[PDB]
A paper describes a structure:
A crystal structure of Gipg013 Fab in complex with the human GIPr extracellular domain (ECD) shows that the antibody binds through a series of hydrogen bonds from the complementarity-determining regions of Gipg013 Fab to the N-terminal α-helix of GIPr ECD as well as to residues around its highly conserved glucagon receptor subfamily recognition fold. The Gipg013 Fab-GIPr ECD complex crystallized in space group P21, and the structure was refined to a final Rcryst and Rfree of 25.5 and 31.1%, respectively. The GIPr ECD exhibits a three-layer α-β-βα fold, typical of the glucagon receptor subfamily of class B GPCRs, with three clusters of intramolecular interactions. The whole structure is stabilized by three disulfide links provided by Cys46–Cys70, Cys61–Cys103, and Cys84–Cys118 residues, which are a characteristic feature of the N-terminal domain of class B GPCRs. On the other hand, the GIPr ECD-Gipg013 Fab complex is formed through interactions of Tyr36, Gln37, Glu40, Arg43, and Gln47 as well as Tyr68, Arg113, His115, and Glu119. The residue Tyr32 of H-CDR1 interacts with Arg113 and His115 of GIPr ECD through the side chain -OH. In addition to this, Thr33 (-OH) interacts with the residues Tyr36 (-OH) and Glu40 (-Oϵ1) of GIPr ECD through side chain contacts. GIPr His115, which provides stronger hydrogen bond interactions through -Nδ1 and -Nϵ2 to the side chain of VH CDR1 Tyr32, may play a critical role in the affinity of Gipg013 Fab. At the antibody binding site, there is a buried surface area of 1050 Å2 on the GIPr surface and 690 and 366 Å2 on the heavy and light chains of Gipg013 Fab, respectively, giving a total buried surface area of 2106 Å2. Thus, Gipg013 Fab has a large epitope on the GIPr ECD, binding to residues overlapping the binding site for the ligand GIP as well as to further residues burying a larger surface on the GIPr ECD.
Residue numbers in the entry:
A (entry chain A): 31 to 122
B (entry chain P): 3 to 133, 140 to 193, 197 to 217
C (entry chain Q): 1 to 201, 205 to 213
The structure:
Amino acid sequence: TAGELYQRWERYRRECQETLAAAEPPSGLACNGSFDMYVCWDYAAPNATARASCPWYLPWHHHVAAGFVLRQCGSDGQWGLWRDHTQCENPE
Amino acid sequence: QLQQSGAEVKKPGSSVKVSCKASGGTFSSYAISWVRQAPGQGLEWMGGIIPTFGTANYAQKFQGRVTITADESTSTAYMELSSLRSEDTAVYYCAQGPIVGAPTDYWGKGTLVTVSSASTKGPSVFPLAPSGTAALGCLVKDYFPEPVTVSWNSGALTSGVHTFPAVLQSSGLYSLSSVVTVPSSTQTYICNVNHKPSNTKVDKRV
Amino acid sequence: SYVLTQPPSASGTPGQRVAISCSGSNSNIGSNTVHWYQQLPGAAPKLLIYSNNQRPSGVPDRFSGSNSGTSASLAISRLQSEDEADYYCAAWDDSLNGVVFGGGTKVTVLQPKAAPSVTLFPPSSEELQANKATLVCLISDFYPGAVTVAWKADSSPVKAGVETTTPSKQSNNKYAASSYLSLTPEQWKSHRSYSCQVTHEVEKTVAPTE
């Protein structure tokens, strides 16, 4: 039921949060470790594609558990505009 | 970030289905929630659905009225409202989000649904200002539905143009008026009014 | 069907803290985290604070969320002009299904008080000719935006049959309202005069004739 899924989302962050709070920023320039509310992201290497685990709060998790959300990091080290959501979602 | 269907006018006891059209890709993954706002009032949650997963979610009190569904291909999620009401006159936004109960950072422009028994009708214009500056203008009377665009002199007259929002007097009919402010000074002034729904345009002098 | 935002409105002065409380029951705020949306005139709602005082991209630390134990609170700790808007708090509800909103709170910032300008027009000749008559009283540039309108048929008697709009904020930093009185060419031609009296914040009256 919706209530349960929602509570689970509420957990997936406040987890991403404390990791991010535990995590100390890289030496060189990198995209901020941050919570976009959908997936949780690592600090990203400069000018690289960041890989994220398929979120667990997401139903149909286990199908996609191994999968990744690919999101590119800027030249600057600014987080890019768009996300690549697949391996994390394919219920069919 | 989602383009909705566009305004709707419907009579009570009827049904309207408005569309929320998402990104060609990146669609099925997130929850789509519908919220409505009656003009001048606060938000009301209706329901939400993860487009490609399970069944839609709803709130109580819409019972057998709102149906939220989604389509695989067109990557659009529509929603339908039956047994329409005046209390249903509002604007309907579709906000994207991670899950159904969760908050939404991505909204749409919203689609306004007006509901009244009033028939489609064009206005009638009357010259104002029998007339220390000068104030003149045109009264646009008894039309429906909104809006009406009011211009001055085939355009190119604005400075001092105030158009007052329409009053709804309860015939079901809307009425407004526009005023140009000016120097008292021989130049002929004519207001060009337009109401598209009834396809009625008028030019009348002063 | 509403977690009550305590406030229909709340005031504030630039550079000071403004707090909007939102009360609830234990199936909603007690049992979950409260969100906060900012809607602007003519605009769609905008996510301000999600999940108990966390924030999304590009939202200054000015805004802050509160406990949720019984009622929550939003705190805008240094005010601005662009901060005047509707603010709707939100939470999921355990007892009865999905999310519920609050009544919202329009927040106010403080500018100079203006004096309403009313122009009053007689029915057009061309309209009278149509056997309809409308007196039209227009009101502009009055802050704050609350005005009341009293119509009078000839000398004193009051008038029931009118229709008045609401004080819309439009154009430049300010509000207007139009008011119509519908009469018949006889009721028109039958009175010594007519008065539109706009009372705001004091009294102004204007009087066409015939």
